[PDB]
Symmetry: D2
Subunit: 237 residues, 4 copies
């Protein structure tokens, strides 16, 4: 199977697989069962922003999620990503719906990684920022139901013409270029990611959520990963 | 054939195909016969830096090349790149040797492109910076004789164990991710590139040069483009 | 008097001092009488974005102004800023009202300057980005009627409690740190600025406009520069 | 007295004030007696690089110092800087000599701070990068013996014509613009700093070291802070 590190914005409490009984943000290291969670006061139909940060010195993966005019939610987990992920990875966004549904609309997404070596000319860096997604967005690998270019957004899961989110949908978008997250002369490696999302559901119980993830470069949507598994994991182990 | 836009650092005067009778920097639009050139006081064995800039408002492709402690050389050409290149491109470095030879060593390479739309959330951007190249540099597509990881550099053309550059060599490196250089809601599109290079030759007459180029995404080394054609063009038309 | 280089968003046609008979964007070099203008379809009450770009190789000051969903306006003028401005400058935003009035609200402002030398460690850079202005914004020098922190914006000219713009108002905001726009070993110097603004007026004839400007470091609002002179110039010469 | 947060590169072991018995890197929170240190294999006459990182989510101030071809040294300390520093600060470099001496030469210095709010237009940022310092470097406040423009470097402490470092010297350089390190709607605040330095001494026992620091905006060199106090503190409490 793939190797996954993810920050999940989990809109549906599956308490049977260890979610808390509320929408939450979580850090997922090789399992959908988050290593750490925090309560998230998800706002149906509002545009939210998630920020994810990490560096190889502190070895702490942290995320903050917020909406305008509201208090944020934050979660952190100590993990050495060099011990979890391969040296080259892809980074992406995933979302899913199941029997419950919601739009999983991404309005912007940015990412920066930096590897600073001990050579005085120190830095290798990659940065991208999408504030509009085009119908044929060649620097993204879209998987599953993900589409780009509808109102200039990235729709990770299926939405009908009329704006209605569909159930049992899964979709991901990965940045085209592999990302180097370790180098042998690196003295500091860091990354940050930000994305803005609009999750709306005609229903009181939206599902299932959106994740920012980092994976093996050849990562693909696991069989049966609609719903609670967020398009990230083959099972709930 | 491919579509090429390039800034050439041409170390060998091929006066039969319109080079001036000295090493020069040139702007090449769909032809090796530069649309504009400037004299370049190339310094054998010294590390030089080239800077290339362009934006869609001014529609002027400009480059400056310099060495420490020396006056720079600059060349500019008015060209609307949106009328030359496709909407998606790859960007890269190329170099070649022929019967005359030189190392075509790249010590660093950075690139930024920005498309700013009329939406208040305006910007799509891509930036990369390499200050060290690793043996398996997965975010570069190496073509021809190009190799990475020898002393942490990108050697565009063949060099033997002993540091000796080889003749009749051609090599390119393209960044892995396609680059979007036009979008329909863009009000300004710009790019800049910088690279540092070390061209050294045991010979009085080094050849052939290094170019930064932008091409169709599927660009490949043209048959017979060693030597004066810089790994960019199939012929000298 | 001060030395001013500015891009003006001129909302009021003063045809007696050479404005065209419509709202326009202009490049002003040491005079309010723009060296170059373009028609601007200013939208009362809508948030617009202005982008300004320049580099020392091309020596062309260009600006683009746009609103969402609308075609942009652009203006360019060939000028060597090193021959106009001192080596150190401040950069800022200015606006004014006169007998006609409008809000001159700045919602965001960013600026980047870069000087790249011929030393392989090439770059001196300054960048700032404001997306919210705080009541006591210590890295801005506010002049005249400019205030910060009202709804997190920079109000360049006086607005009453009720949101009503006041006539005969002038205000500027300059970034606190001087900016180096030339250095003796520089081979390329460039800058870009972006700001977002909301100009609204209860009146059919708003006035007078907003400018991004660059000036001597000690620049101050000229006596009698309310109205058509945009807080930039002492007279209309 | 001022409020100081600093990362020290302490070249001289003053074991009487709690330094370890070797050159070390340290995190100093309101005291010269570092809260955390790590051994540093300082290399006399070689150019080293220090990197400092912090964010308000993790509340961990970390630094890494390295030389080319050598293993790095790193130190971290959990501290909420919002509880130590005022909301606006200046950032700078300090160094000193005492009865023992060394050059305290800064060859480059860069700094980025970011405050990201919960408003979807999230970011306030400041970034500067110096790779050459000019004789009259108007965006730096030089204090004590600090000078700029000698070989394009920042010499924090006194050096004679002949390159000889002088004893009993203290000097600092602060960036001109205040820096906002907290805002009330901020959900993440972060900073990073990097500088490159050349510490050389004709003596076996160089002293005293270089620090990157953050202080009240009006920070000044404390009386009697030559030597072990690094130009940062009035005493060794
Ligand atoms: Ca769930
Ligand atoms: Ca040639
Ligand atoms: Ca006017
Ligand atoms: Ca000490
Ligand atoms: Mn969960
Ligand atoms: Mn040529
Ligand atoms: Mn005008
Ligand atoms: Mn110490
Ligand atoms: Xe992640
Ligand atoms: Xe974060
Ligand atoms: Xe990572
Ligand atoms: Xe990453
Ligand atoms: Xe990383
Ligand atoms: Xe190019
Ligand atoms: Xe350039
Ligand atoms: Xe381009
Ligand atoms: Xe490009
Ligand atoms: Xe471009
Ligand atoms: Xe300007
Ligand atoms: Xe522009
Ligand atoms: Xe400028
Ligand atoms: Xe400028
Ligand atoms: Xe500039
Ligand atoms: Xe610090
Ligand atoms: Xe660090
Ligand atoms: Xe800080
Ligand atoms: Xe800071
Ligand atoms: Xe900070």
């Amino acid at each position: 199977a793939d190797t996954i590190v993810a920050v999940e914005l989990d809109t549906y409490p599956n308490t049977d697989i260890g979610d808390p009984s509320y929408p939450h943000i979580g850090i997922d290291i090789k399992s959908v069962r988050s290593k750490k969670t925090a309560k998230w006061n998800m706002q149906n139909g509002k545009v939210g922003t998630a920020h994810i940060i990490y560096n190889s010195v502190d070895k702490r993966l942290s995320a903050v999620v917020s909406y305008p005019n509201a208090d944020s939610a934050t979660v952190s987990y100590d993990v050495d990503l060099d011990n979890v992920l391969p040296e080259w990875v892809r980074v992406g966004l995933s979302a899913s719906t199941g029997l419950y549904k919601e739009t999983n609309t991404i309005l912007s997404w940015s990412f920066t990684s930096k590897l600073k070596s001990n050579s005085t000319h120190e830095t290798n860096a990659l940065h991208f920022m999408f504030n509009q997604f085009s119908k044929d967005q060649k620097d993204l690998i879209l998987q599953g139901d993900a589409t780009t270019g509808t109102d200039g957004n990235l729709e990770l899961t299926r939405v009908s013409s009329n704006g209605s989110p569909q159930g049992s949908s899964v979709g991901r978008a990965l940045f085209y270029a592999p990302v180097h997250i370790w180098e042998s002369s690196a003295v500091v490696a860091s990354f940050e990611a930000t994305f803005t999302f609009l999750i709306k559901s005609p229903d009181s119980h939206p599902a299932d959520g959106i994740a920012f993830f980092i994976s093996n470069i050849d990562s693909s949507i696991p069989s049966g990963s609609t719903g609670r598994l967020l398009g990230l994991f083959p099972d709930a182990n």
